[PDB]
Amino acid sequence: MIQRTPKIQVYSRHPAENGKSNFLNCYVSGFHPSDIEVDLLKNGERIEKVEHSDLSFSKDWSFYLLYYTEFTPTEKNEYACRVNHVTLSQPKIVKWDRDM
């Protein structure tokens, strides 16, 4: 058996087709087992309108999850990713660094 802690990256992107849109992205990588809970948070509250989630695996071993949604960042709001996994003793919260 193997278990691996997820690596978590939070960042923003503009689709080149559009430019108008800004997307908040949580990239959760290299984890095992695949059981996982992932949420985007605004000011601490769960964002239930998350339009996109892509899951893949490399070898039979490690899993990769891209979780993202459109958003409009202001200075007044905090955005974060929350991840719970069997390898974590407590949910991990990773805050969005505003120029990433």
Author numbering: 0 to 99
What does the paper say about this structure?
The D76N mutant is strongly amyloidogenic and, in contrast to the wt protein, aggregates efficiently and abundantly without seeding and under native conditions.
To better compare these data with crystallographic data, the crystal structures of wt and D76N were determined from diffraction data collected at room temperature (RT) rather than at 100 K. The RT structures are highly comparable in terms of conformation and B factors with structures from frozen crystals. Although D76N β2m rapidly converts into non-soluble oligomers and amyloid fibrils in solution, the intrinsic dynamics of both wt and mutant forms of the protein can be studied in the crystals using solid-state NMR (ssNMR). While this is in principle not surprising, as loops may feature significant mobility also in the presence of crystal packing, it is intriguing to observe that the fitted order parameters are consistently lower in D76N than in wt β2m, reflecting an increase in flexibility upon mutation. However, in D76N, major changes are clearly observed in the EF-loop, as well as for the residues at the end of the A-strand. A second mode affects the EF-loop and remote residues at the end of the A-strand, and produces a clear experimental signature only for D76N β2m. Mutation of D76 to N weakens a number of interactions with charged residues. In particular a salt-bridge with K41 is lost and the interaction with the R97 side chain that mediates an interaction between the C- and the N-termini of the protein disappears. Overall this explains the higher loss of β structure at the N- and C-termini in D76N minor substate, thus linking the lower fold stability with the increased aggregation propensity in such minor substate. Enhanced aggregation propensity in D76N appears to be correlated with the existence of a high-energy state characterized by a loss of structure in the protective edge β-strands.
